[PDB]
Amino acid sequence: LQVTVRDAINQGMDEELERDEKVFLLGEEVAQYDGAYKVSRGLWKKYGDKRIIDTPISEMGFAGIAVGAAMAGLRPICEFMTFNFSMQAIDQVINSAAKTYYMSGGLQPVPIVFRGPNGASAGVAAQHSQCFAAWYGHCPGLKVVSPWNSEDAKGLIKSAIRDNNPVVVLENELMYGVPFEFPPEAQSKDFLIPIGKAKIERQGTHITVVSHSRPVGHCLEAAAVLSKEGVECEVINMRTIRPMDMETIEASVMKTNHLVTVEGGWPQFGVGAEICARIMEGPAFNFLDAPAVRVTGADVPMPYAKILEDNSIPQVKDIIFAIKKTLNI
Amino acid sequence: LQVTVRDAINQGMDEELERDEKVFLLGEEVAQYDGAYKVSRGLWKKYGDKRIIDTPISEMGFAGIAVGAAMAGLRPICEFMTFNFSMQAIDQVINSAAKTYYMSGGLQPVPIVFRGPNGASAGVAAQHSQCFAAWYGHCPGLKVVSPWNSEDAKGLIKSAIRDNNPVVVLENELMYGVPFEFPPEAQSKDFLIPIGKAKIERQGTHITVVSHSRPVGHCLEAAAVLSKEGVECEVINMRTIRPMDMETIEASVMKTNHLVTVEGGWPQFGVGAEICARIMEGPAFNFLDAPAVRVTGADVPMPYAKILEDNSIPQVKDIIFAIKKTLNI
Amino acid sequence: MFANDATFEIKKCDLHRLEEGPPVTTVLTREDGLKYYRMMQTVRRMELKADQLYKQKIIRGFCHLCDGQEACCVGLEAGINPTDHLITAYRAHGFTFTRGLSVREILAELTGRKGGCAKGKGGSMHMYAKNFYGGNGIVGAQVPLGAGIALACKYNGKDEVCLTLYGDGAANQGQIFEAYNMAALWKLPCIFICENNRYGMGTAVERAAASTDYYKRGDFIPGLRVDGMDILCVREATRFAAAYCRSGKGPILMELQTYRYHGHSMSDPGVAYRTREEIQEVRSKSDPIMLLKDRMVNSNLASVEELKEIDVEVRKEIEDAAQFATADPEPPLEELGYHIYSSDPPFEVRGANQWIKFKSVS
Amino acid sequence: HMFANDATFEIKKCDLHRLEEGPPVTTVLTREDGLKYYRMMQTVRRMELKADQLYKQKIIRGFCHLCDGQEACCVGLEAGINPTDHLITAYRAHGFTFTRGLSVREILAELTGRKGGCAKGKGGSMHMYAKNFYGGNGIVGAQVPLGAGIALACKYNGKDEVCLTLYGDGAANQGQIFEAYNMAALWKLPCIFICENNRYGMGTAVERAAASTDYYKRGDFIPGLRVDGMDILCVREATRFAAAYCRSGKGPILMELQTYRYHGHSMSDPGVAYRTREEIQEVRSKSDPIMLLKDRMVNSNLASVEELKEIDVEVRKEIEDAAQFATADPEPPLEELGYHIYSSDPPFEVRGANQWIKFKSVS
Ligand SMILES: Cc1ncc(C[n+]2csc(CCOP(=O)(O)OP(=O)(O)O)c2C)c(N)n1
Ligand SMILES: Cc1ncc(C[n+]2csc(CCOP(=O)(O)OP(=O)(O)O)c2C)c(N)n1
Ligand SMILES: [K+]
Ligand SMILES: [K+]
Ligand SMILES: [Mg+2]
Ligand SMILES: [Mg+2]
């Protein structure tokens, strides 16, 4: 059967809430508005004030409250409406949650989770269209994941709940609604996806393609098209931004000798940047028959006008084109 | 005439303020306590309360007020006591300041300046040691720079005050006390350093070593040691971090065929991530005769113990180690 | 022939830390009344219009309408000057128009077109104008900015003031309380104004705020609470409040007590957190445009005929603005990179990939 | 010579804000509490002055904020609350960590950055943790929201515990504090918000930073009381009252403690270009927390000066033995550099200053 990313996340949270009472959820519009993007639908009607909590509009202040509940030994899920509004809290995530276990000599684990839409939506312009993979990826003590499809989402966020450390879950607003096949095994209440493992979504032999979040959809379509000129793409879905499964990438480039990276967020100091850095530095460099290239969004804050917007995140066209330049076909 | 980095900054603000009256400065302890690290010493006495404002411990607030002044046509200098603190206010930096000009379709400029110490000090520990070069360098709409010596700091600050866009001037606390000589033209109150241009600190032919902020002095350190053995490093000092001067790195790599990048902050998604990525995407790539490699801080939150801290930042030891792996000498 | 003015009785404000509030009696001239009605009715129709242009998809992303709040945006402009300063959140159409922006230019940005006021770059939240500064989509983030604008007034010493609005759900944002304290500490020409429309996205004033007396939140700052449904009230508290700032006694909080007819953005059916027939009640018994009308007709300031003529001319500015912004070319794609930096030489900005190059000129 | 078993001391009465009665003006103090409270303040004072010495000698680096002058505060507080209650504070936490269970060896060693200190040399002065003490926090204000959550956790676990969330005059202008307030008020969280007002926010004094130095009122919708912070006995009487409050399901409260720091802001601040040495000299004669109690004890025959001098020497003697340890104690091994990044995870690999530098990392 088909389940949309939205309800995939929902069952994960629901299975966990069910499973451990120490876990609760809070954010803006999260209980009786049923969540801003309806992710937490019915959760309130089933668990009550105590476990599903509507917050005032005070990001800084409830991130903090969540961090602290976790320190006292609860297991909170904190929702930001979107990660753009996580900047008001970013010091709560960074300095309180992330670096604690460490500074504390391993006496104070912070088992928090921060989930929400991240990246680009549609016509929301600059202050709201921003991608935070790069920023959260960069810091010790965070685990930072970024799902794509439904199996991804329900598996990635259960895990995240079970983990004992800060985990930042970069969801995608345009993926909530998209149905995917849901395998019989992801329908289990036990379905965990290990954080730190990538997943090869398509075999192929002519060139490796890595991306995370929604861009994955667009490499499959870009790969589908190229398969018709008998060009085989290996499409790797990263899932985890930190700690990023570099090996699977490397293993694939030693088969394919060709790498392209595809991300939504901005170019400089991007998720692309690092994957390339990592390749050049690792064993796969001498196997690269052509330079690895990044396909990113555009180096502008996000415009509003449709024509502009579409030319500011990666099209299937833009991906094919890069691949065609690299494979010099 | 040797002058200290801290004196260079102080001279520039003094020169700029005197020359334009729309410019003023704001932050904690700037006024009467003479600046937290005494950078703003004597300035209150010269220009008084109208122009040098002591402000409460309200980062998110005063970051915001300073951006309001800028929009209204003033030219604020906005001091954060360290950049670890500016996380609270980072959303006024990215979201108000950086994107504004472009969202307004070229209607609203924001001639702000944010400045302060960045990165590691000595035994200040985890919440107080972090480099933010990477984070700020990401966002379109900003200008990020990172002085090394004294010439740097004066030129870079004065340019920063004269630019009409939001400009992050990350300085480094351990460098304030450090005395360099101060060539005649840099004492002229007319001295600007073009934002966007790197400068070679040392001619070389064997390898290109690229850095920003404090590490740059360790690169020349390490080149003195290395040159004794017949290696000739070309130490490049980045100066700007966005719009970074790649063309100068690239013209240098094309001549040395090798590349080490050195930075103070964490590895994943760092300054060096972006330098590699560009190199590899760029025309220099095919001049490379070995992988480029990075030296960074260790991938931990800054520890407090001396030997732990010591091994968390890059030594003359570790740069040299990498220059030898790369040169295979 | 018509009476030339009339005096009206308006609601005594609630005061906090003041001995005297604005006057309970006010004088309204026929010439202002007609100007104020033309305005409220332009704003109102410009919103029925955008709403409809949303539903046909001609507009995208965000669109937060501000009907019910027209007493505010007009009442405000009514009691400040061109030389004063206004900054606000996202519910900005009313203010954008009252500060010099044409309907053509507003509608053209909603539909993302080259002739729109942000050149299609910013959409519904990011309209800027002469001495109007947005248009801010990050909640609470415009309060420190307004206090900064304030700071520049005081610093330029031109005796201007600054109105800095936030809504009721926004009155818990930390950055406001910090702003009250610098505001008061430095005695800034900043009027803090809270548009209390009773809801905070979906979450009603009492479910999110421990005290729902926003005019007293300022604490040390003196505050006043107003009827934001009545144009006259809003004009008298503003003038009052602006007198206060002009004379140097620092900041002052205004709680404008209004109502929004539509849901939050256009993707809110609007009716989960409130019955449709509360909304109806408010529209029937205290609509703001319907309140200026009962006053004007009744004190012989204008005839049911004249206001009809204006519905009419207004019906017209709106049709044409609608029709000019639906038929307007989107921005040329070459101009995606324009206006990243001010006053800089031209440079090159990177597209989806490294071969897509865009020119950026200030 | 027979000593008394107890005395009654009048305390200053508190200023109230939306409160009916406040704490009573007259407490009993027994002999055995007296002896102990004195000993504790004495340990703190002595510990602080030893930290000063060691810092001047380069054995302590980085930050070092001394609570010196504000010992009435921590012993005051530990004395009004259970050991199962909860406490979280800024960065001047040397006193609380002792009063909260940690030993002087452990604290002096973490300060000196040694394997034996409580965070095994990783923390420094600002980051120390004990049973129910969440440190130990260097982002001014950050600790206020955390603390409100520790407090939520208490409500959630239904255990009657309460959380003490200390901030200073400086921090009191932080937005997030006001965010916290609203949330505790709204959710009726068992949370004593405490403003440790010692008159200075680094070098910037009260007046120049608050437009309103009535901190116990700052919260506004949350009731508040203002308290003599040099009188260990108030602090204990006020704390005791405020915990009873928070404990009775009535929600959060605000307590302003008026106190003083003898040292400038932190070792590197001379502390003497934003107030005069006589300003200091006068406070230390009219309100020192240790002298002020010793008089109380001697006068009411709760004990002799010769006895209280026996405590002085012993503590003094013992701080000396702690510092002897923390200078002697070895530094942490390099191997451990990367230990304790993640919790309950398999061991892994962390990048050093370059790629051929690998640090094992274990939970
Ligand atoms: C910092 C931040 N948090 C959350 C959001 C999402 N958000 C947008 S509007 C809004 C509600 C604000 O409501 P209110 O202050 O009552 O203003 P109104 O819509 O009624 O004009 C929220 C929570 C945001 N834009 N910014
Ligand atoms: C968010 C943040 N801003 C600024 C600083 C720098 N800073 C640290 S302590 C301090 C003074 C704090 O004043 P107060 O609350 O009174 O602390 P106390 O005097 O009790 O030590 C300042 C300005 C910081 N650590 N964190
Ligand atoms: K968890
Ligand atoms: K500038
Ligand atoms: Mg509202
Ligand atoms: Mg203090």
**Would A2-194 and A195-328 be classified into the same CATH topology?**
yes
Q: Within 10 Å of residue B128's Cβ, how many Cβ atoms?
A: 25
Residue A116 Cα to ligand 3 middle (Å): 15
Q: Which phi and psi angles does C310 have, rounded to 5°?
A: -80, -45
Best of C67, C139, C268 to mutate for ligand 1, by most ligand atoms within 8 A of CB? Answer: C139
Alpha-carbon gap, residue D314 to D307, rounded angstroms = 11
Q: Within 10 Å of residue A94's Cβ, how many Cβ atoms?
A: 26
Alpha-carbon gap, residue B169 to B248, rounded angstroms = 21
Q: Which of A28, A59, A151, A274 is catalytic?
A: A59
Token pair for residue A101? 């276990």
Strands D163-168 and D86-88: parallel
The closest-lying atom of ligand 1 relative to the alpha carbon of residue A29 is 23
What would the 3-class secondary structure string for chain C be? CCCCEEEEECCCCEEECCCCCCCCEEEEEHHHHHHHHHHHHHHHHHHHHHHHHHHCCCCCCCCCCCCCCHHHHHHHHHHCCCCCEEECCCCCHHHHHHCCCCHHHHHHHHCCCCCCCCCCCCHHHCCCECCECCCCCCCCCHHHHHHHHHHHHHHHCCCCCEEEEEECCCCCCHHHHHHHHHHHHCCCCEEEEEEECCEECCEEHHHHCCCCCHHHCCCCCCEEEECCCCHHHHHHHHHHHHHHHHCCCCCEEEEEECCCCCCCCCCCCCCCCCCHHHHHHHHHHHCHHHHHHHHHHHCCCCCCCHHHHHHHHHHHHHHHHHHHHHCCCCCCHHHHCCCCCCCCCCEEEECCCCCCEEEECC
D158 in contact with chain A, both atoms CB, cutoff 8 A: no
Is residue C133 within 8 Å of residue B71, measured between CB atoms? yes
Note the resolution in Å, 1 decimal.
3.0
Name B188's Cβ contacts closer than 8 Å, sequence gap at least 6.
Answer: none
Alpha-carbon gap, residue C281 to A175, rounded angstroms = 39
Alpha-carbon gap, residue B84 to D141, rounded angstroms = 13
Is residue A128 within 8 Å of residue A309, measured between CB atoms? no
**Rounded CA Rg of chain C:** 21
Of A270, A271, A276, residue with least CA distance to A238: A271
Which amino acid would we find at residue D359?
F
Interface test with B, best of C340, C349, C354 (most B CBs within 10 A): C340
The Cα-based distances of D360 to A110, A196, C199, D118, D351 in angstroms read 21, 17, 53, 21, 9
Q: Say how many domains are in chain C.
A: 1
Alpha-carbon gap, residue C28 to C12, rounded angstroms = 17
Q: Which CATH number does the domain A195-328 belong to among 3.40.50.300, 3.40.50.970, 3.40.50.920, 3.40.50.2300?
A: 3.40.50.920
User: With respect to CATH, is domain A2-194 assigned 3.40.50.970?
Assistant: yes
Q: For residue A13, what is the DSSP state?
A: H
Task: Using CA coordinates, name the residue in chain C closest to A323.
Answer: C353
Is C197 touching ligand 1 by the criterion CB < 6 Å?
A: yes
In DSSP terms, A23 is beta-bridged to: A75
The Cα-based distances of C232 to B212, B215, C71, C237, C291 in angstroms read 60, 64, 8, 9, 10
Of C113, C86, C94, C89, residue with least CA distance to C47: C94
Active-site annotation holds for A232: no
Chain A positions touching C329 (Cβ under 8 A) are: none
Rounded to the nearest 5 percent, the helix, strand and coil shares of chain D are: 45, 15, 40
Beta strands per DSSP E along A59-192: 75-79, 113-118, 143-145, 167-172, 179-181
Whether residues D204 and B304 touch (CB distance < 8 A) is answered with no
At D20, which CATH number? Answer: 3.40.50.970
Beta strands per DSSP E along chain B: 2-4, 23-27, 52-54, 75-79, 113-117, 143-145, 167-171, 179-181, 199-200, 207-211, 233-237, 240-242, 259-262, 293-295
Q: Which of B29, B128, B221, B232 is catalytic?
A: B128
Is residue D164 within 8 Å of residue D81, measured between CB atoms? yes
Chain A positions touching B285 (Cβ under 8 A) are: 291
A160 in a known ligand binding site = yes
Chain D positions touching B58 (Cβ under 8 A) are: 173-175
Whether residues A104 and D123 touch (CB distance < 8 A) is answered with yes
Q: Given phi > 0 = left and psi -120 to 50 = alpha, else beta, which region is A128?
A: alpha
What is the extent of the structural domain holding D73? Answer: 1-363
Ligand positioned closest to the Cα atom of A158: 3
Ligand positioned closest to the Cα atom of C167: 1
- Report helix, strand or coil for B186: helix
The owner of tokens 């054995």 is D59
Q: Helix axis angle, A59-72 relative to D143-156, nearest 10°?
A: 50
Beta strands per DSSP E along A150-189: 167-172, 179-181
Task: Using CA coordinates, name the residue in chain B closest to C114.
Answer: B105
Alpha-carbon gap, residue D123 to D5, rounded angstroms = 43
The owner of tokens 């994957």 is A275
Q: Within 10 Å of residue B320's Cβ, how many Cβ atoms?
A: 21
Interface test with B, best of D178, D202, D354 (most B CBs within 10 A): D354
Chain B positions touching C339 (Cβ under 8 A) are: 101-102, 104-106
Alpha-carbon gap, residue B253 to B10, rounded angstroms = 36
Token pair for residue B203? 């001619």
Q: For residue D122, what is the DSSP state?
A: S
Of C236, C262, C289, residue with least CA distance to C39: C289
Parse chain B into domains and list their residue ranges.
Answer: 2-194, 195-328
Which amino acid would we find at residue B237?
N
Of D3, C346, B80, residue with least CA distance to A91: B80
Token pair for residue D16? 């109230």
B317: closest CA of chain D, how far (Å)? 10
Q: For residue D68, what is the DSSP state?
A: T
Active-site annotation holds for A128: yes
Q: What is the dihedral sign for C-alpha C54, C58, C63, C69? A: negative
Q: Which of B15, B28, B59, B201 is catalytic?
A: B59
D140 in a known ligand binding site = yes
The Cα-based distances of D23 to A206, B12, B52, D10, D242 in angstroms read 79, 56, 44, 12, 8
Whether residues C141 and B95 touch (CB distance < 8 A) is answered with yes
Strands C162-167 and C190-196: parallel
Whether residues A60 and D176 touch (CB distance < 8 A) is answered with yes
Is C137 touching ligand 1 by the criterion CB < 6 Å?
A: yes
Alpha-carbon gap, residue C205 to C225, rounded angstroms = 15
C169 in a known ligand binding site = yes
Alpha-carbon gap, residue B165 to B329, rounded angstroms = 46
In DSSP terms, C203 is beta-bridged to: C200
Residue B70 Cα to ligand 4 middle (Å): 9
C283 in a known ligand binding site = no
Is residue D170 within 8 Å of residue D182, measured between CB atoms? no
Breaks in chain C at C–N > 2.5 Å: after which residues? none
A308 in contact with chain B, both atoms CB, cutoff 8 A: no
Alpha-carbon gap, residue C84 to C242, rounded angstroms = 10
Alpha-carbon gap, residue A152 to A169, rounded angstroms = 11
Alpha-carbon gap, residue A149 to A32, rounded angstroms = 26
Chain C positions touching B95 (Cβ under 8 A) are: 138, 141
